[PDB]
Design a protein around this ligand. Structure first.
Ligand code: ATP
Ligand code: ATP
Ligand code: A1BD3
Ligand code: CA
Ligand code: ZN
Ligand code: ZN
Lengths: 694, 146, 49, 48
């Protein structure tokens, strides 16, 4: 593995058809026999691993204890027909057969797998690099054919990307992807987050900050992966372990709890349909259930208790699952502003930014980087801005003890506070907790869940408050969210239209109050007249209430003007009211909703077209790539897959710096500096090596 | 075939075969596909309409029972909202079908302590249910065409 | 996919589809790993015949 | 019609330079090329 690493290092900054690569191929050709022997070792054992799991082998293995005789093993191998006689003999020799000639195929298979995985991966990487940089060499294609099984096995675990290197030249980078990382990526929640991020960056995303947003999404996804790992399942300590178990179970089953709450609300309201009101018990009215069974009231009581409990559990599940990402993001953005922007050092928020004013509290707190990884951001800021803005002043701002900074470096000190309730109270940071509580209460989902809980509690006082929880069907169903978003999209415009409607009705009311009072009597009994427009407020209420609701307008309600000196004036009045108010303004509302539908549709369509036509990374169109068959698919899956960039970031974070290659160190330093120039924009390996590749 | 056989038992079952004009005519298939395209969305909209009418029914059953008498003969009163199920049926049946909403059907609140509450109730019912939700249906069909 | 299990063992499986030899092709492809007799039982095949 | 007018104006300004009319693709051959072209090389404010 070390020697292969050295060879791969020799191949750093290697152009297509480079001398070093060609001489490597020549060396491999000179060493062909031994390379073939190595590949045969790997392929034999890889094939054995799957064969021993194959049921056909289980047919030959009769012995209950799971052991297989040498003869039966040979028969099974020849039945599979994937091995030659010499290979079967070699496998038998490697088998640690007991004196009874019996073999443990499980350990036989599992023995050489783990030791040889790193070398196998590096051999695959070597061969892939060499093939891609020397596309036409039968000597290399033969080796690849011999290594086919290894490459198939390591395909999911081989990540490849392209960067702009220090040499002003696009370079392909090969690295390893962990199975856990791939699985956590394939989890549905990560996929939904990816879809949302893509939609946002494509519909309202600037190309300049696209890569910064992508990197932020990658960091947030890593944090969520960590959360999922923590919650995943395989006397104060006992109490603590059960507490964390319960919280993790709540976090895992958060959504199921939400659905359960919705179902309980539906059942409660189904029951509530049965109430009746009577003067007598089953002057002040009584609300009593009506059922033949009589079992319905205790069922409602229980359902209410369970609904309230589920609401509280959903609060806990949210606080455990999703709040940490909120705090992580808020802390991260504050840290980046401090280090690079220097907000509270030089710029200072405008006082229109309530979040910027609120974040001042946590600067001096020790626990500031609680959820965000960088615990040294304070010292970094002190180094960056201390000279101009004062080290002591920065320390006062950030709650730093200049003396203790030095001692921490000189040596580690252990002030062991053996666990205690008072020690925990001391550990509590009031200011940080207050800042966090402000953030959470500002979070919308927390507010909605809190309203849910409060409405359930009020439902216990009066059971009819449980109907409000039926509004949760919106958030439950994506279709309802889309339909409601259609209205919300132009909600401000709708409110303005309603205000205009009110104004026009006010003007019509003025005209009626001045010229058309006599026509607004709503009483048949002549002795007692009920005039709706003798007062302006009453006339306005009458118009807004009846005329808008009417199809033909106010004229439908008010008295026929036939045979009157103001007949023509009033017919103009009524017809204009009808056309302007009933027809147009309503039509404006319906058209706004219709336009919202089309706007959302074209947003989704545009996102899909952009993703299908262009690469998210380089921006080159599908046509250039499709010049080669399936070129865009290969580009978006192999060459410029964003998942591979994310995996590369995780791989760099986990890898030690000393082990970093030149490319890895380059990208790592640029990531730390927050420079995204290494991302290939407008260029690709194919385009760079167009003539050499063909 | 089954509907024809049942038509032999009762000749009026032969009317169902007039629905075959859809499959017969491509134009009818396109027009119907316009509706089917967003059919799930339409069903969800109808469910939302039912929910909002249920909420309005709760409000009426609690605060506005007196206004739901549909009988002119004072001796015999016919109260539609003395029971929640009856009130819900009344709302969903008359108010949606009405152009101005339930307020058109139920008794004038003039000169009452809850007059402003009820006018808000009726106007909000009119705007949310009659105007918007229907408008959502029409816009869904229009969008399907495009 | 669950319903299609019934027709595998049937002689008349490739009744309308031209390939009458798909069963033997599958036996050749997957017999070694998954067992010739087992494939034959799955596909209603008589190894002797 | 009004919506598509605004959308077309925005797309034209984001895709092409107001001055030269060359598309964003040519410039984006170089990273951030269109941004540099519209801010430095062919900024209309600079002509004014
Ligand atoms: N750099 C890129 N990396 C990945 N996909 C890209 C890239 N550029 C464009 N794409 C487009 O994104 C598509 C990714 O697939 P898609 O967005 O449909 O999601 P998915 O992971 O396949 O699954 P699902 O459809 O279930 O969400 C690729 O097929 C390609 O069309
Ligand atoms: N020759 C050009 N000069 C300037 N901008 C150009 C030119 N050609 C195209 N543009 C586009 O015009 C945009 C100018 O920005 P924009 O029109 O959003 O206004 P602004 O001055 O940044 O501020 P605001 O959005 O507040 O009005 C550039 O980002 C670019 O997209
Ligand atoms: C989710 C946090 C992961 N992470 C990161 O996103 N960038 C880093 O530089 C780093 N160093 C240790 N962990 C890191
Ligand atoms: Ca080193
Ligand atoms: Zn690309
Ligand atoms: Zn220009």
């Amino acid at each position: 593995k070390d020697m292969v690493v050295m060879l791969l290092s020799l191949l750093e900054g290697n152009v297509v058809n480079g001398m070093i690569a060609r001489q490597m191929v020549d060396m491999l050709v000179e060493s062909s026999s031994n390379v073939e022997m190595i590949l045969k070792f790997f392929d034999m054992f890889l094939k054995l691993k799957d064969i021993v799991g194959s049921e056909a082998f289980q047919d030959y293995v009769t012995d209950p204890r799971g052991l297989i005789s040498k003869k039966d093993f040979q028969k099974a191998m020849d039945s599979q027909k994937q091995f030659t006689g010499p290979e079967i003999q070699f496998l038998l020799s490697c088998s640690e057969a007991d004196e009874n000639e019996m073999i443990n195929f499980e350990e036989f298979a599992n023995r050489f797998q783990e030791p040889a995985r790193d070398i196998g991966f590096n051999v695959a990487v070597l061969l892939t690099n060499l093939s891609e940089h020397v596309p036409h060499d039968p000597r290399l294609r033969n080796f690849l054919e011999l290594a086919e099984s290894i490459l198939e096995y390591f395909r999911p675990y081989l990540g490849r990307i392209e960067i702009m290197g220090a040499s002003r030249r696009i370079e392909r980078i090969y690295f390893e992807i962990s199975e856990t990382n791939r699985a956590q990526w394939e989890m549905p929640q990560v996929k939904e987050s990816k879809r949302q991020f893509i939609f946002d960056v494509v519909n309202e995303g600037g190309e300049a900050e696209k890569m910064e947003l992508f990197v932020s999404f990658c960091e947030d996804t890593i944090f969520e992966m960590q959360i999922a790992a923590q919650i995943s399942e395989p006397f104060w300590g006992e109490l603590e372990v059960q507490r964390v178990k319960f919280l993790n179970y709540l976090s895992r089953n958060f959504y199921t709890l939400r659905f359960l709450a919705l179902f309980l609300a539906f059942a409660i309201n189904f029951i509530l349909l049965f109430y009746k009101v009577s003067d007598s018990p089953p002057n002040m009215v009584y609300y009593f259930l009506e059922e033949s069974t009589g079992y319905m009231e205790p069922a409602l009581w229980c359902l209410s208790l369970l609904h309230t409990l589920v609401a509280f559990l959903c609060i806990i599940g949210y606080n455990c699952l999703k709040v940490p990402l909120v705090i992580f993001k808020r802390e991260k953005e504050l840290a980046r502003k401090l280090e690079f922007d220097g907000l509270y050092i030089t710029e200072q928020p405008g006082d229109d930014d309530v979040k910027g004013q609120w974040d001042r509290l946590v600067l001096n707190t020790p626990s500031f980087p609680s959820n965000y990884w960088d615990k040294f951001v304070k010292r970094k800021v002190l180094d960056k801005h201390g000279d101009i803005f004062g080290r002591e002043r920065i320390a006062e701002l950030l709650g730093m003890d200049l003396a203790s900074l030095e001692i921490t470096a000189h040596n580690e000190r252990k002030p062991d506070p053996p666990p205690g309730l008072l020690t925990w109270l001391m550990s509590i940071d009031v200011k940080y907790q207050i800042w966090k509580f402000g953030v959470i209460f500002t979070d919308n989902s927390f507010l909605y869940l809190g309203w849910y809980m409060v409405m359930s509690l009020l439902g216990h006082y009066n059971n009819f408050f449980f109907a409000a929880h039926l509004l949760d069907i919106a958030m439950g169903v994506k279709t309802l969210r889309t339909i409601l978003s259609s209205v919300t999209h132009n909600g401000k415009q709708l409110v303005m239209t309603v205000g205009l409607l009110a104004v026009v009705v006010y003007l019509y009311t003025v005209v009626a109050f001045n010229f058309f009072r006599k026509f607004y009597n709503k009483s048949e009994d002549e002795d007692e007249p009920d005039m709706k427009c003798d007062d302006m407020m009453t006339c306005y209420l009458f118009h807004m209430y009846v005329g808008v609701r009417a199809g033909g307008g106010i004229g439908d309600e008010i008295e026929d003007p036939a045979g009157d000196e103001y007949e023509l004036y009033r017919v103009v009045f009524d017809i204009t009211f009808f056309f302007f108010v009933i027809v147009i303004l309503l039509a404006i509302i319906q058209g706004l909703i219709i336009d919202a539908f089309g706007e959302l549709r074209d947003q989704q369509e545009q996102v899909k077209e952009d993703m299908e036509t262009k690469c998210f990374i380089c921006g080159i169109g599908s046509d250039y790539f499709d010049t080669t068959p399936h070129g865009f698919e290969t580009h978006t899956l192999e060459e410029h897959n964003l998942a591979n960039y994310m995996f590369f970031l995780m791989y760099l974070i986990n890898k030690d710096e000393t082990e970093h290659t030149g490319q890895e160190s380059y990208v790592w330093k640029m990531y730390q500096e927050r420079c995204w120039d290494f991302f290939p924009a407008g260029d690709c390996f194919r385009k760079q090596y167009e003539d050499q590749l063909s």
